[PDB]
Design a protein around this ligand. Structure first.
Ligand SMILES: O=C(O)c1cc([N+](=O)[O-])ccc1NCCc1c[nH]c2cc(Cl)ccc12
Length: 293
């Protein structure tokens, strides 16, 4: 009874409406690399469990449907995302109390999925859904390949690297939950400054933009970095910039927390659970955004 109303993202995502009840959902259609072989059972097993793992700051997975050549994921629908909201707020800034609320909520959602050994892997502002009630939710998890979904390969894919953790760019074979903390730290700085922190346009440009701000990492601040697969001794050596320059005019509580979310060493980067205890959040509230829907 659900019909496509409108394309809302590009898998490709549609606003779908029930032609009798009015109910609206987000329908995500993921094309596969095969026309006949469908999705392996083990991937459907892993995806399906997330229907029963719920948190207020994670988008709700409503149904999973698979065919010989497609995977469909049905999600709850929200009208807006943080990318759109920052663009609408870009000339003035999202107010600090709302920045703080959104960051706290996103840490709550990450603490939940990391506690269940699920990573997001691809956090971006456009993947963070917001509503009129002040909630923000993690969406568009980068789980297709981790679960074994045989997604269609795209030979000329243009990937946004801006939020990617430096251990990923240096070729780490195993990701940790810390990759999501890095991405969220980047998004935190973007809401504060109204500009993306590290908008690189290739993997080496992404790395060098990080290096020119936080300093070229070495064994002193990131033990093991020089053994990472894509580390090069010939990297240019940039001095570290102070966080007072990176995120003015964030107060020292916020700068403190941001420095721990952007720690080079993923083993020392603050956990989502520990970040919730940070003094930055001692006056946190739940304001509402003014949305033009
Ligand atoms: O967002 C997507 O596009 C997506 C794509 C695939 N995929 O393609 O394999 C699988 C899952 C996806 N989302 C899961 C969202 C979710 C609901 N409840 C959760 C509980 C935890 Cl702990 C962690 C995550 C969730």
């Amino acid at each position: 009874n659900f019909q496509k109303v409108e394309k809302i993202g590009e898998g490709v995502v549609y606003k779908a409406r029930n032609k009798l009840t009015g109910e609206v959902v987000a329908l995500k259609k993921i094309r596969l690399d095969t026309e006949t072989e469908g999705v392996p059972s083990t991937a459907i097993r892993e995806i399906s469990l997330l229907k029963e793992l719920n948190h207020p700051n994670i988008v709700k997975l409503l149904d999973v449907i698979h065919t010989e050549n497609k995977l469909y994921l049905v999600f709850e629908f929200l009208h807006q995302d943080l990318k759109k909201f920052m663009d609408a707020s870009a000339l003035t800034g999202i107010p600090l109390p709302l920045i703080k609320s959104y960051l706290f909520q996103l840490l709550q959602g990450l603490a939940f999925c990391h506690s269940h050994r699920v990573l997001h892997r691809d956090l971006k502002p456009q993947n963070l859904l917001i509503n009129t009630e002040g909630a923000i939710k993690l969406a568009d998890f980068g789980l297709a390949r981790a679960f074994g979904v045989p997604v269609r390969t795209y030979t000329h894919e243009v990937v946004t690297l801006w939020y990617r953790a430096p251990e990923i760019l240096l070729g780490c074979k195993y990701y940790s939950t810390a990759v999501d903390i890095w991405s969220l730290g980047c998004i935190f700085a973007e809401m504060v400054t109204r500009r993306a922190l590290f908008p690189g346009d290739s993997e080496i440009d992404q790395l060098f933009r990080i290096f020119r701000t936080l300093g070229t990492p070495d064994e002193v601040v990131w033990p093991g970095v020089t053994s990472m697969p894509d580390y090069k001794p010939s990297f240019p050596k940039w001095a570290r910039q102070d966080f007072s320059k990176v995120v003015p005019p964030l107060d020292e509580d916020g700068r403190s927390l941001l420095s721990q979310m952007l720690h080079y060493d993923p083993n020392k980067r603050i956990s989502a659970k520990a970040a919730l205890a940070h003094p930055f959040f001692q006056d946190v509230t739940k304001p509402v955004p003014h949305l033009r829907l």
